[PDB]
Structure formats: C-alpha cells, structure tokens
RNA sequence: UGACGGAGCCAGCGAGUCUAACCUUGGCCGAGAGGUCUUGGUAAAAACUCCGUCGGGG
C-alpha cells in the first residue's frame, strides 16, 4: 500500500480537495505545479503554510490539489486552506502527534483560517 | 571649435495645417481623415526612419511623400485606404380617428 | 447581336431607374435542362477565366479568419513583405466570437468587402458569422490552403504557411469567379462589375464560364451541368431577366 | 573623456579620449599619460566611452559622430548503470 | 489470385507483431530500445534460462 | 550589461549582449542633452533643452518618476552622485548648478 | 425599347396562364 | 495482365475536412510570380 | 424525486458500500460487464488467451 | 477615475418531440393550390492579471 490522506478546503463557491501521499517532495495544483498560481500577487497567499512550517516537512511528501468553483480569490483561499489542512492530517496519521501539535501551533499562531472556514453566515438584528 | 548640422514649424498639406514636433504618422493623422496603417504604409514606401519629427524630413522626401499621398493610384495604393411631412399625416390621422372613438 | 443588344438595354435602363442605380453588379442565370445532384453547401467553387481578370486584391478590403493561436500567421503575414499590404484584418475565430455580436456583426457586414477563412474553420464558420452573411452569394467566405501541406492518416500534421502561396491564391481568386452547386436547374453566376470593362469583356466571360460550366473534365470542379443548358438570363440585382440562346 | 581601471588588461589604467577628427586615443597613467593606441573615425567624433570596470561579458567602446553616427566596436567572449560500473 | 497473396503477406504481419507481445509475458529481463528512426524494440539480458 | 546614448529629443538603451536598442525613451518635447545612469543603476536623469530635468527609472520609459523644473535656460550636463545616492546636481545655460535632493 | 417589350412578354405570359 | 503477374510473381485532398478538393483555388503561374 | 433528496439522512449505511463505488462528480459509476469480477483479467488468462 | 492590440485565467442558478422574423429580384415545374431554385436589404461570463502601442463633440 501507500499512506495517503485526501483533505478539503472551501471559500464561498470554490471547492479544493487535495490528497497528500507520501514521495519525493513535489507540489501540483490542477494539473500545474504550485508555482503557476494565475491570481500572481496572491501566490504567496498560497505559498503561506508552505513557508510557515518550513520546506523539509513538504521536501518528504506528494501533495496535489484540484480546485473548481468560485473565482479568483476564493480559489486562491481554498488551496491554501486544503493544503494546510493536509499537511496537519498527514502528519497526525503517519508522522507522530508532537509534530502534528506543533504543525497547529504554528498554523493557529499566524491565521486560524488555514485550518477551520469561517462561513460568514447572516445575522438578524 | 566649431559644429555643423546636416526647421520649420506648423505645415499646411490640402486645406490642414500639420504640426512639427510630433512623429510623422501622427502628422499623417492629424490630416484630416486617413488612416495610421495607410500613414505607415506611405511612410515606409518613402523609405524613412519612422521615429522622425516633422521638422525633420527636408523638402525633396517632404515633395515626394506629398506626391505619394495626392497620387495613389501611381504607387499601387490598395482600395482600403481611402476614405416629417409622414410624421404630420400619422399624428392627424390617429387623433381625428381615436377622436371619433372618443365621441362614440 | 441579341445578347449585345441586351446589354445596351441593361445598361440604358439602369442608368434609368433610381434602384437600378444603387446596385451596381451583373448576374447570369443559367437554366439548364436536368437537375443538378450536389446538395448545397456553402463552399464557394470558383470558376476560371481565362482572358480578363475581374478584381484585385489592390481593391477588395479582405479579412482573414486563422486557427485559434494565430501568432506565427499574423506576424508573418503582417511582416513578410508579400502581404502586408493585402489583408485589411487577420482575426482568430475567438476572437471573431469574443469580439463581435449583433449590431457589431452587421457593422462587420457593411464594412468587409471579402473575407477568406481557413478551410480547417470554414465549417464551422456559419453561427459565428451570422445570418446576414449567408444571404445569397455576394458575401460567401471562402477557403484558401494556409502551409501548401498535406496530412495523412495517424499522422501529426505541421503547422506553417507561406506568403507567396496565399497572394497567388488570393490573386487567383481575385482574378476570375464563382458559383455554387444547387439543386433545381436555375442557377446563378455573378459575371462583372458594371463598370469596371466593357461588353466584349463581359460576353468572352459569359462564353469562357458556359465553356467551363458544360466541360467534362475537371468534374471535381467543371463538370457539374446535367444535360444541355436550356437558356441563359442576364440581369443585376433589380432588373428583370433578359434572354440569351433559349435553344 | 573617459577613464577606466583595474579590468582584464595589459594595461591598469586606461585613460581615453576622443578628438572631433575621428580620433579617439587612449594614454595610460603609468607611463606619464602616453599615447598607447588610436582608432579613427570618419566624421568629427562627439562623444566615447569604453565599458566599466566590471563588465565580464563582451566589452564595449562606443563613439558618438556629429554626422548622426553611432559607431560600436566589441571585444567578444552515458547511462547510470555504465557510470557505476 | 493477387488478393490472396496480399490477405496472406497482412495475415503474416499480423502474426508477427502478436508474437511479438507474446514474447513479452514470459521472463527475462528485457530493455526497451527504441530505434532513432522512433520505432520500439527490444532486447534481454544475456542469461542462460533454465 | 546596458548604455544610454543621447540623441535629438531621443535617449536610447543599448544592451551589451546583443548590440540592439533594447528601448527608447522619446517623452521628450525638446533636444534633450543629457542621459546619465545612477550610481546605483536603478534610475536614470535625462536633462533636456527646455530646461528641466526628467528622472526616471531605466527598464520602464512609461513611468516618469520625477520632473525636476530647473532652470529656464536649458540644462546640459545632470549627474547624480557618487558616493551618495539620493542628490542630484545639474548644470545650465544659467551659468549656476544647483545640487538638488530628489 | 426593349426591357418594356419583354417585361411586356412576361406579363403576357402570366395573364394568358 | 503484365502488372498482375509482376505483382504476382514478386493532386490535393483532406481526409477529415472533404471540402478542400471543390473549394481549393487553382493557383496560377503568372499570378504568382508577375508584379501586379 | 426531489422530496427523496431532501429527506436523505446521511447517516444511513448499507453493506453494498463496499461494492458500490461513487463517481467524484456525483453521479453512480456502474460496470457495463454486469459481474462482480470481469473487471480486468489475470496474467496468466491473458497468457491462455493471447 | 483611460482608449487600442495580443496572451492568460475563474462561476452559479438553468433542460415540456419543445426555441422561434420580415418584405424583395427573377427562373423552372404545376390546370390550380402551391412546390422548388435564385437575388437584395431591413429586426434579437464580465470585471481581473500580464505584455506591447498611444498620448473638447455633428
């Protein structure tokens, strides 16, 4: 077999599902690798989680991302959210739970929405 | 200790008087109602830098592009590059007609 | 003598009639005796001629419709030194879609005078085009071969094209007519400008079309009459007809 | 005038200049400002300047005519199992 | 007579590319060589079978 | 790797590694005298005949970072410095150069 | 006189049908 | 009968766009080279 | 239909799930060989049937 | 508080054998009704990002 962890990510109308697997340290979204992000200021809004945590705990594993649904800026959000999300789960399941803690340490630190949508539902006064 | 060059201002070409300071094409366009590829075409078939500013140009290639852009016809120049009383009747008809149906 | 004399007439009684004044070109209708089998598409054949050209491409504004990534055609048929002076526009037919609806479609239609489309899009050129554009056969696209290349079966075709290849074919195409394949025995072929030559001009074409028309070689594109031509009726767009060789 | 030093030389300092006669003539200031070498060119020469210090691709001297001439002149510049075995 | 000889040269040709593949199932160790002119072949390992 | 040169109402960048005008800074209304670099490389002056100078970034002709009115006789030499990179000192017909800080 | 004769012709023609 | 026994004792065209045989344009010698 | 969709309750298991596969766009996936296991073939069948 | 020309890239509702003009030039067939051919003119994803160009109205 092959460990592997699939994780979602969602703004408004904009779908993200990734599967991180273990391998050789490449990182694809939709059928590109992550440094053709199209939105090209929002790049390192993608690029967030990846240098938060560093780049060796990304250097040991595959991840690939297809998104659909949304526009631009919630596209953007829902990858960076899938990836995060991701990488916390991986390394929960395979890698050991010290690692996973201090992985939603440094995440929850810098932004919360990384990890948990806040879906901006209404209020009636 | 001296140097030597090699100006005149505002031009009149067919009834349009056309500026210096500005590049050739857009001169070309600031005559009254030709196109700016028909002003490239003619410019590179006089053969001269595009860049130059009308003040440039001195008078033998200034005659010629003028010679060029009166007679296209001679420089095989391609064909792309020229350039109530009802309202009264129906007014008194509708009302004088409705007007009866108004009475009726 | 009576075709001679139909011209004079023609002519007379255009300069006559107001209408007859706005339009501004000669048809011939050709009725032949059998049907005619070839359903009608809108690939315009052309038909040549061998004694007097008619256009040239120094008169027709021409636009030309490419595949879709277009760059290598544009700069090459814009830079080449061959046809930079040829095509009025080059357009891709993304963006003839993207850029062109409606009244914006009609303004294409009274501004082109000729547009010539890659044979690989002509089919598929209709719904873009509109409506208006297949309105008999004055405006009809037609299809001219980009690269001079062939391609075979299982076989990855190159994509070029060459200058020299697209101005001998547009100047041949400039150069004589057209016609259209039906299917009654009335058809049409628009034969001369009004103006542009004159009568023994315009009858060597009449004889030099029929000769093509009725040859049986080139059946590809020349043998396409069924039986012998009954008669053929000249006129312009609002005359009447008028009557040539009845038997 | 122009004036350039310590580059990949013969010479360490060159110290150059350029004469409305096409001549442009290049001293060096070790030897008390002699002439070392000379181009010339047509027209009456404006303007020159050699390439800086640190220019480590193909070197340049650029003179400038009063005849609208720009003159240019450069100096240029198997398989993984077979390996193991 | 001149179609039977071509249905039988196609039906030879045939053949040999299935048996072709079929060698390709047993064993061995093949490579993959692929001729310049971009056509596949191959080739095993010089190892005495048993 | 690149060179300005001046021209009438035209300053060029030339590129080293090809030996083509790679782009043309033409904005100018009048003979324009002077094209200098920075110290630095970034930014470019180019003092015209009109009397003013215009500092702006070299790789970018569209964007005119700076227009310095000077003088109204016209300005021939503009330098920046060389050891300091934000003062700027220009010359005129006005027979006085005046350091500015841009 | 002779695009009114065979305008004339046609009408004729279609009046005696 | 001769290329029978030989064998037994041994132009323009699209193949997906068919239209191109009627629509193509007879290219012409003159009207290609000649300056007009 | 509609009222069947709205009244889900998605919790519900039936042992077909681990038979029963769901296309990623939505809709059910469905084996045109009407079995269990014709699937795909072994080596050796293939090897019989080549 | 831009306009022009290329390139790139992103949605959600929508799904009844039902979805769609007009007049006109003439030819051929038909006893008609009409059929068919022909000709001409009138009506119904964007913003976004990148690169190149430009610099008071009939």
């Not at chain 3, 879609?97 to 598929?124: C, E, I, P, W």
């Not at chain 3, 074919?169 to 001369?192: A, E, F």
């Not at chain 8, 029978?4 to 007879?26: C, E, M, N, W």
Request: net charge positive; glycine share 6%.
């Amino acid at each position: 077999a092959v460990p592997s962890v699939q994780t979602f990510g969602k703004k408004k109308s904009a779908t993200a599902v990734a599967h991180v697997k273990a391998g050789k340290g490449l990182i694809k979204v939709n059928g590109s690798p992550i440094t053709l992000v199209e939105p090209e200021i929002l790049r390192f809004k993608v690029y967030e989680p990846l240098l938060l945590v560093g780049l060796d705990k990304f250097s040991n594993i595959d991840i690939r991302v297809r998104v659909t649904g949304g526009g631009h800026v919630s596209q953007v959000y829902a990858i960076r959210q899938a990836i995060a999300k991701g990488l916390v789960a991986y390394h929960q399941k395979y890698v050991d739970e010290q690692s996973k803690n201090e992985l939603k340490k440094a995440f929850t630190s810098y932004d919360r929405t990384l990890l948990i949508a806040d879906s901006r539902r209404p209020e009636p006064k | 200790s001296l140097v030597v060059q090699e100006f005149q201002h505002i031009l009149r070409l067919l009834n349009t008087n056309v500026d210096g300071n500005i590049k050739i094409v857009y001169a070309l366009t600031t005559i009254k109602g030709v196109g700016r590829r028909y002003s490239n075409l003619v410019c590179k078939k006089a053969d001269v830098d595009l860049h130059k500013r009308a003040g440039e140009l001195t008078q033998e290639e200034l005659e010629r592009i003028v010679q060029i852009m009166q007679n296209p016809t001679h420089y095989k120049i391609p064909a792309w590059f020229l350039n109530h009383t009802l309202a009264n009747n129906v007014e008194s008809k509708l009302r004088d007609d409705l007007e009866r149906l108004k009475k009726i | 003598g009576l075709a001679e004399k139909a011209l004079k007439a023609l002519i007379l009684q255009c300069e006559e009639n107001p209408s007859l004044k706005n339009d501004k070109d000669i048809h011939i209708i050709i009725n032949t005796g059998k049907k005619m089998g070839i359903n009608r598409d809108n690939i315009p054949r052309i038909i040549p001629l061998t004694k007097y050209k008619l256009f040239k491409p120094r008169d027709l504004n021409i636009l030309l419709i490419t595949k879709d990534p277009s760059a290598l055609y544009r700069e090459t048929l814009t830079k080449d030194e061959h046809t930079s002076e040829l095509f009025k526009e080059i357009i891709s037919v993304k963006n003839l879609r993207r850029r062109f609806k409606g009244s914006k479609l009609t303004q294409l239609y009274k501004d082109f005078d000729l547009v010539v489309a890659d044979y690989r899009v002509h089919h598929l050129l209709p719904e873009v085009l509109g409506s208006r554009f297949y309105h008999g056969s004055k405006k009809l696209p037609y299809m001219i071969r980009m690269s001079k290349e062939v391609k075979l079966k299982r076989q990855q075709m190159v994509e070029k094209c060459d200058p020299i290849y697209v101005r001998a074919q547009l100047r041949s195409i400039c150069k004589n007519t057209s016609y259209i394949p039906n299917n009654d025995n009335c058809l049409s072929v628009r034969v001369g400008y009004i103006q542009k030559h004159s009568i023994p001009e315009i009858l060597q074409n009449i004889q030099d079309t029929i000769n093509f028309l009725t040859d049986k070689s080139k059946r590809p594109q020349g043998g396409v009459i069924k039986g012998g031509i009954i008669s053929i009726f000249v006129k312009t767009s609002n005359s009447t007809s008028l009557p040539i060789y009845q038997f | 005038l122009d004036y350039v030093e310590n580059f990949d030389s013969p010479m360490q300092s060159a110290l150059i200049a350029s004469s409305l006669d096409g001549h442009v003539k290049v001293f060096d200031p070790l030897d008390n400002f002699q002439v070392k070498f000379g181009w010339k060119f047509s027209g009456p020469v404006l303007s020159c300047a050699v390439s800086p210090s640190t220019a480590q691709g193909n070197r340049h001297l650029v003179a400038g005519l009063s005849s609208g001439l720009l003159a240019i002149r450069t100096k240029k510049k198997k398989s993984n199992n077979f390996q193991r075995m | 007579v001149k179609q039977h000889l071509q249905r039988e040269t196609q039906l030879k040709q045939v053949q040999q590319r299935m048996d072709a593949q079929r060698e390709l199932l047993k064993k061995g160790s093949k490579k993959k060589i692929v001729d310049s002119s971009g056509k596949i072949s191959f080739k095993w390992k010089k190892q005495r079978k048993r | 790797h690149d060179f300005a040169v001046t021209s009438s109402t035209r300053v060029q960048i030339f590129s080293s590694r090809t030996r083509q005008v790679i782009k043309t800074f033409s904005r100018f209304k009048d003979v324009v005298y002077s094209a200098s670099f920075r110290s630095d490389g970034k930014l470019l002056c180019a003092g015209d005949a009109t009397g003013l100078v215009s500092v702006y970034d070299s790789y970018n002709p569209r964007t005119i970072l700076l227009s310095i009115n000077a003088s109204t006789h016209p300005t021939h030499v503009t330098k920046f410095h060389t050891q300091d990179n934000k003062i700027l000192a220009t010359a005129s017909d006005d027979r006085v150069t005046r350091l500015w800080d841009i | 006189d002779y695009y009114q004769q065979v305008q004339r012709g046609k009408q004729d023609k279609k009046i005696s049908r | 009968l001769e290329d029978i026994q030989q064998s037994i004792l041994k132009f323009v065209k699209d193949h997906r766009y068919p239209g191109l045989t009627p629509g193509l344009a007879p290219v012409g010698l003159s009207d290609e080279e000649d300056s007009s | 239909l509609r009222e069947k969709a709205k009244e889900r309750n998605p919790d519900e298991y039936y042992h077909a799930m681990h038979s029963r596969k769901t296309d990623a766009k939505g809709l059910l996936i469905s084996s045109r060989h009407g079995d269990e296991e014709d699937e795909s073939l072994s080596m050796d069948q293939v090897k019989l049937l080549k």
